[PDB]
């Protein structure tokens, strides 16, 4: 019975899972886009969002400072977190990360793999799945319906 559980078991225990997520968060802060297992990335996304919030909390905040000191293992990323990532996420509220499932690993384990990426990075944009255009048959029919509803008011 695992009713109402939000964290999945990873690594060799709770502390090992924390350390794995910490390494993944350090790599994500450093490279602005990484790829790992789907479950590990899905677990790391929330920590990345909370880290961006703690970075937006400010530089002089001792709580945020010690949180960044714990999580970011490479100590050259804390100034980066506080002066690049947090300032560029100002008008946004919670849309800091983007996670997309990429094809399974070409290795023999065939692991379900995802890629996580901080929005607004200096990297080639991933092939995001774009919706259909309004010129499609069904979309044009729905546009006609919308125009009829607008004219009826």
């Amino acid at each position: 019975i695992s009713h109402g559980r939000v964290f999945r078991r990873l690594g060799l225990g709770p502390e090992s899972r924390i350390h794995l997520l910490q390494n993944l968060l350090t790599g994500l802060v450093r490279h602005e886009r990484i790829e790992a297992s789907w479950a590990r990335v899905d677990e790391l996304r929330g920590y990345a969002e909370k880290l961006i919030d703690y970075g937006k909390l400010g530089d002089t905040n001792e709580r945020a400072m010690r949180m960044a000191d714990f999580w970011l293992t490479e100590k050259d990323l804390i100034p980066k977190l506080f002066q690049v990532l947090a300032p560029r996420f100002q008008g946004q509220n919670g849309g800091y990360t983007r996670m997309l499932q990429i094809p399974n690993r070409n290795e023999q384990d065939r692991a379900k793999m995802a890629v996580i990426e901080y929005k607004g990075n200096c990297l080639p944009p991933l092939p995001l799945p774009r919706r259909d255009s309004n010129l499609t048959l069904l979309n044009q029919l729905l546009q006609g319906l919308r125009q009829d509803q607008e004219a009826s008011s």
Binding site: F7, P14, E15, I18, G46, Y47, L51, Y54, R66, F70
Partner: protein
């Protein structure tokens, strides 16, 4: 007959600047479950309607209270009990607090329900914070820290003392205790460990420390908007 003059207040906001802070009782904070907020709204309306009749004051863990309960089998229909608040636990209409007092060498603990209609009057005789949010170690502490005068007079405090925190280290009975208060899961600062435990005992108790829980960032419960909405509802009910 002559009556003496009252003593009015000489607050001067000019030289000292002092603002005012809000206090929300812990029973209004909803738990972390996925319950529908409509249940919390209903319970909050009920407990506000109850507080409209019964004045539930502000008191923290460590304060000394006196509760008057309706007892049918006593001489008088009321029964008073004075004791220190050991812990406050529960959410909504079922919030409870534990009062502890040593009466004739026998320590007695009573778990009172805040919103029980059998409670006539709750009186905080000493509004007082302590070094721990739950001082359940008073069972294993010396009795002098649990004896309180049942006929003690209420101590009136002014607003500008901001609930003085009592930094009182407590002596302890010999081992074993009701719980292992030396473990890091309790995080107790109100026990004088340096006189009852030893260095190797502290080192062995430090084996159960989990330093990652303070930096997990995912086990925290942010209730800023919830508390704001609760305060808005409280002000609306008070104005209604």
């Amino acid at each position: 007959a002559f009556q003496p003059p009252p003593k009015p207040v000489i607050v001067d906001k000019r030289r000292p600047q002092r603002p005012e802070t809000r206090f929300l009782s812990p029973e209004f904070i909803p738990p972390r479950g996925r319950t529908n907020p409509l249940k919390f709204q209903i319970e909050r309306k009920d407990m506000l309607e109850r507080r409209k009749i019964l004045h539930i004051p502000e008191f923290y863990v460590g304060s000394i209270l006196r509760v008057t309960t309706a007892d049918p089998y006593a001489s008088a229909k009321t029964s008073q009990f004075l004791g220190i608040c050991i812990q406050r636990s529960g959410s909504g209409l079922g919030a409870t607090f534990i009062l502890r007092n040593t009466i004739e060498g026998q320590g007695v603990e009573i778990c009172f329900e805040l919103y029980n209609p059998r409670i006539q009057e709750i009186q905080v005789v000493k509004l007082e914070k302590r070094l721990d949010n739950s001082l359940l170690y008073l069972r294993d502490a010396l009795p002098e820290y649990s004896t309180f005068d049942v006929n003690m007079k209420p101590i009136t405090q002014e607003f500008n003392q901001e609930v003085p925190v009592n930094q009182l280290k407590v002596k302890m009975k010999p081992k074993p205790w009701s719980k292992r208060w030396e473990r890091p899961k309790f995080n107790i600062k109100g026990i004088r460990f340096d006189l009852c435990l030893t260095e190797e005992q502290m080192r062995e108790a430090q084996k159960w420390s989990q330093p990652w829980l303070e930096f997990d960032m995912m086990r925290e419960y942010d209730t800023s908007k919830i508390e704001a909405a609760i305060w808005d509802e409280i002000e609306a009910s008070k104005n209604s």
